[PDB]
């Protein structure tokens with residue numbers, strides 16, 4: 001429950017319908033129910049899971065940033081006191097965002113990561129674990145911020161170690177992991193040099209491997225490769 | 237509850253923050269709590285109420301249309317039987333959409349419309365009543381479809397009668413009401429001639445009144461006037 | 473492409 | 479204008 005009575009295949013079917021309807025919260029709940037059936041997910045199913053939550057949390061993070069900006073301006077010299085509402089509502093959004101991150105991190109811990117033995121699945125789930133801890137780090141301000149940052153780092157690092165050993169440098173999961181770990185270095189860990197080095201090296205190694213790819217692989221590696229280039233252009 | 241413990245002014249403040257964050261479901265819940273305080277709403281507050289729900293229901297209607305399209309294709313000759321999931325999920329979205337329409341219609345009935353004495357507020361709320369019954373009519377297929385359509389018609393009609401007597405032909409509420417009642421005629425009531433006549437007459441009477449307006453009024457009447465022209469162009 | 477309402 | 483992630 002609430003998805004326990006629905007067939008696994010029906011939850012998958014509805015997640016795809018929710019995707020087409022851009023109903024990402026429904027899509028995420030259907031995929032959570034599918035994961036809770038206890039069977040490993042296929043490649044396509046892992047992509048549905050990650051798309052659903054990426055979109056839900058993406059909307060919450062964008063909202064949190066809007067409210068945090070407002071809050072920060074209300075705290076500047078000469079700003080009129082408007083009471084607690086900005087902080088209260090930023091906190092409301094923050095708590096819901098944290099709850100989604102905790103839900104995803106719990107699915108990964110119970111029991112996606114432990115049953116994931118192939119590199120494609122293991123690296124994928126570890127990247128998600130890195131991403132959701134990174135989203136927790138974006139709003140963390142307390143006693144726990146360092147440990148949250150280290151949790152993101154550790155998950156990304158293990159994903160990077162496996163992806164380097166087991167996946168070609170053009171593999172889209174390897175390229176996306178490196179893109180996000182580079183963003184983690186730049187904006188969470190205060191390590192813009194490391195972020196730039198990682199994006200550069202990633203991009204360069206992928207470029208040198210493109211010759212091995214079919215026209216279709218070439219297209220999808222080059223897409224993530226453009227996001228690496230976008231960041232390098234922004235950061236340098 | 238759940239907004240009963242929050243100050244009216246705080247709910248208004250948070251609705252505006254939710255608007256800026258494009259968190260329309262929160263915005264709608266804050267404005268429902270504000271309405272439930274039992275005081276009339278100001279012009280600006282009425283606009284927040286309508287924007288919040290328009291966006292929430294707009295997202296649900298767009299999703300419902302996507303799922304209805306899929307459903308209709310699955311019912312065509314030669315389409316592979318895929319089971320009940322499309323119909324189930326269309327029904328899920330439909331029920332939630334109906335619930336939002338019922339929530340708005342209940343706020344209007346308890347007690348916005350009865351306490352609204354000025355034309356600007358009365359016409360506004362009656363237009364909303366027309367709109368939310370029209371959204372119910374878009375998904376209605378049963379015993380009740382005709383009565384739902386007539387409820388939308390009756391609300392729009394009373395709004396039109398008051399707006400013609402009490403508001404200039406350029407008033408943006410009068411122009412928006414006429415735009416939506418024209419859409420109601422075209423696509424709900426199967427009366428495209430009436431829809432076109434209403435859009436034409438509305439547009440023409442507004443054009444003849446523009447000379448009375450300040451530069452700022454001129455701009456906002458002409459905006460809705462363009463949506464009337466867009467429809468006339470589409471329909472003729 | 474879709475009719476306008478407001 | 480905002481850095482990319484995926």
Ligand SMILES: C=CC(C)(C)OC[C@H]1O[C@H](O[C@@H]2C3=C([C@H](C)COC(C)=O)C[C@H](O)[C@]3(C)/C=C3/[C@@H](COC)CC[C@H]3[C@@H](C)[C@H]2O)[C@H](O)[C@@H](OC(C)=O)[C@@H]1O
Pocket residue numbers: 019047048050051054124125127128172173175176177220223224484
């Ligand atoms: C269209 C949506 C669905 C059906 C859910 O698929 C999402 C997408 O799923 C695959 O793409 C994945 C993928 C994305 C691609 C970069 C999108 O590519 C194109 C050309 O649109 C973005 C998605 O969020 C997704 C699933 C996520 C990841 C990311 C997940 O970390 C945990 C690592 C990088 C990237 C990998 C897994 C990509 O392979 C496919 O290879 C894409 O198809 C094509 C032709 O490129 C498809 O759009």
Ligand SMILES: C=CC(C)(C)OC[C@H]1O[C@H](O[C@@H]2C3=C([C@H](C)COC(C)=O)C[C@H](O)[C@]3(C)/C=C3/[C@@H](COC)CC[C@H]3[C@@H](C)[C@H]2O)[C@H](O)[C@@H](OC(C)=O)[C@@H]1O
Pocket residue numbers: 255283284286287290360361363364408409411412413456459460478
């Ligand atoms: C920006 C959002 C908020 C703060 C909520 O305001 C919504 C908007 O509120 C007013 O606009 C109303 C209004 C809309 C205007 C057409 C938007 O105009 C511009 C230039 O952006 C669309 C909105 O949904 C809203 C509130 C709704 C209605 C509609 C409601 O039926 C129950 C009837 C037509 C229209 C009327 C009420 C418009 O006056 C204002 O006159 C607009 O401001 C300007 C400069 O035109 C402002 O963007």
Ligand SMILES: [Ca+2]
Pocket residue numbers: 047050051052054484
């Ligand atoms: Ca994803």
Ligand SMILES: [Ca+2]
Pocket residue numbers: 283286287288290478
């Ligand atoms: Ca509105």
Ligand SMILES: [Cl-]
Pocket residue numbers: 088089092250
């Ligand atoms: Cl709040």
Ligand SMILES: [Cl-]
Pocket residue numbers: 014324325328
């Ligand atoms: Cl369903």
Ligand SMILES: [Mg+2]
Pocket residue numbers: 007008
């Ligand atoms: Mg089963």
Ligand SMILES: [Mg+2]
Pocket residue numbers: 040115116117118
């Ligand atoms: Mg396994």
Ligand SMILES: [Mg+2]
Pocket residue numbers: 243244
């Ligand atoms: Mg009070």
Ligand SMILES: [Mg+2]
Pocket residue numbers: 276351352353354
């Ligand atoms: Mg009154």
